[PDB]
C-alpha cells in the first residue's frame, strides 16, 4: 500500500580526472531511514563503463569497472577497480590456425595498489605467407610470455594508479609488447585483456580529491 | 540375447553355483 521508489534520491556519478567525459550516469539509493545510511550502502557499487562513453574519442570495446570509493554530496566519486574487454572483441580475436599467447602478472604500483594484469597475443600470418598454419614453437611462445611479464612489471612498478590507467586508455603496454616480440614471433592483436584489483590501502580522501582534480 | 547380458547371466549362475558348492565345505 506504498510506492518504495518514492523513498529514493538519484545521486550523480563522477569519473576521476584521468578521463575526458566527466559524469557517467545516475543511481537511485534509499534515504537514510533508520540505522542504514545511503552513503555507506552506496560505497560499493561497480559501474561497467565502456571507454568510448568515458573518453572523448577512443575504442569502445574496452570497459572500466569503477567503485564509488566515497560520496561528497549528490556526487558518487569513483576510483579504478579493473579494466575488462567486451567478450564481443575477446571472442572476435580468438580464431583458428594461429597461436593464442597469454601472460598474467600479479604486480604492485608505487602506492599500495596491487593489480593482476592479463595480456593476450595472436601470431600473425605474414604478407607473403602461403602456409595456412601460422603457429609458434613452445620456446618462442614462452619467450613472448616472459617478455609480456617483463614489460607489464616495467610499466606498473615504476608509476602510480593514474599513470598506468593513462597507459591503459591507449594500448601503450599492448603496442610495446607487439613491438618488442617482433624479433621472437610477429603477433598482431596484442592487448591487455583484463586488469583486476586485489589490494587497496586505507582510504585517504585527499588522495581521491587529487584523483578528482 | 545381447552377448554382454548372456555373459552377465552366466556369471550370476556361476556365482549361485559357488554359493551352493561352498555349503558342503
Amino acid at each position: 500500500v506504498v510506492d518504495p521508489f518514492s523513498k529514493k534520491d538519484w545521486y550523480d556519478v563522477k569519473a576521476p580526472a584521468m578521463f575526458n567525459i566527466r559524469n557517467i550516469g545516475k543511481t537511485l539509493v534509499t534515504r537514510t531511514q533508520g540505522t542504514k545510511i545511503a552513503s555507506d550502502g552506496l560505497k560499493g557499487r561497480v559501474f561497467e563503463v565502456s571507454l568510448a562513453d568515458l573518453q572523448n574519442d577512443e575504442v569502445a570495446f574496452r570497459k572500466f569497472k569503477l567503485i564509488t570509493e566515497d560520496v561528497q554530496g549528490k556526487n558518487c566519486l569513483t576510483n579504478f577497480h579493473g579494466m575488462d574487454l567486451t567478450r564481443d572483441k575477446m571472442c572476435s580475436m580468438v580464431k583458428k590456425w594461429q597461436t593464442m599467447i597469454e601472460a598474467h602478472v600479479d604486480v604492485k604500483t608505487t602506492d599500495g595498489y596491487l593489480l593482476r594484469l592479463f595480456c593476450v597475443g595472436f601470431t600473425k600470418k605474414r604478407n607473403n605467407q602461403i602456409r595456412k598454419t601460422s603457429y609458434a614453437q613452445h620456446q618462442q611462445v614462452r619467450q613472448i610470455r616472459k617478455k609480456m611479464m617483463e614489460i607489464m612489471t616495467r610499466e606498473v612498478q615504476t608509476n602510480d594508479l593514474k599513470e598506468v590507467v593513462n597507459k591503459l586508455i591507449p594500448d601503450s603496454i599492448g603496442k610495446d609488447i607487439e613491438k618488442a616480440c617482433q624479433s621472437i614471433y610477429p603477433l598482431h592483436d596484442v592487448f591487455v585483456r583484463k586488469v583486476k584489483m586485489l589490494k587497496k590501502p586505507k582510504f585517504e580522501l585527499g588522495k581521491l580529491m587529487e584523483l578528482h582534480g | 540375447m545381447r552377448a554382454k547380458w548372456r555373459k552377465k547371466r552366466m556369471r550370476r549362475l556361476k556365482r549361485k553355483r559357488r554359493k551352493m558348492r561352498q555349503r558342503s565345505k
Binding site: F5, V13, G25, L28, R45, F47, D53, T86, D88 | -
Partner: protein
C-alpha cells in the same frame, strides 16, 4: 519516482539484464550499477500457461511492461546485457531474447551498448544427463 536531471539534452541511462533461457525469459532493468533494480518482469508472470513461459510473445509483453514501468521512474535509455543459461549448459540465448530487445526498442526506450554477459566457463563441473546423454 523522479530523476531530477535537466529537461531535454541529458538521458537517464539504465541497464536491462535480458536472461533468455529455453524454458523462461527475464527482462530486468537496473541502474548503471546493477546493485539497485528498477523493474523486473519474466515470461511466466505475463502468460497463464507453463509451456510458453519462454515464448517470444511472453518476452514481448514482459519488455513492454518493463519499458512502461521504466518510463514512469524517468529512465529514457538502456544499456543491454544479454544472457543465456550458460555454465555447463547451453550458451545460445533462448527465443525470448530478440523479441524482448525489439519490444522495448518499439516501446519508446533508447538503446545504448549491447553485450553478451553469459556465464562461459574456462571449464565447469560435469553437465547434467548421463554418459549417453538425454535419450528421446
Amino acid at each position: 519516482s523522479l530523476g531530477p536531471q535537466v529537461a531535454e539534452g541529458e538521458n537517464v541511462f539504465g541497464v536491462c539484464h535480458i536472461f533468455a533461457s529455453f524454458n523462461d525469459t527475464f527482462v530486468h532493468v537496473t541502474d548503471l550499477s546493477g546493485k539497485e533494480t528498477i523493474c523486473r518482469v519474466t515470461g511466466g508472470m505475463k502468460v497463464k500457461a507453463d509451456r510458453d513461459e519462454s515464448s517470444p510473445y511472453a518476452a514481448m509483453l514482459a519488455a513492454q511492461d518493463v519499458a512502461q514501468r521504466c518510463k514512469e521512474l524517468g529512465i529514457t535509455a538502456l544499456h543491454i546485457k544479454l544472457r543465456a543459461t550458460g555454465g555447463n549448459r547451453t550458451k545460445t540465448p533462448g527465443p525470448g531474447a530478440q523479441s524482448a530487445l525489439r519490444a522495448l526498442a518499439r516501446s519508446g526506450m533508447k538503446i545504448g551498448r549491447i553485450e553478451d554477459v553469459t556465464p562461459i566457463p574456462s571449464d565447469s563441473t560435469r553437465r547434467k544427463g548421463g554418459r549417453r546423454g538425454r535419450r528421446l
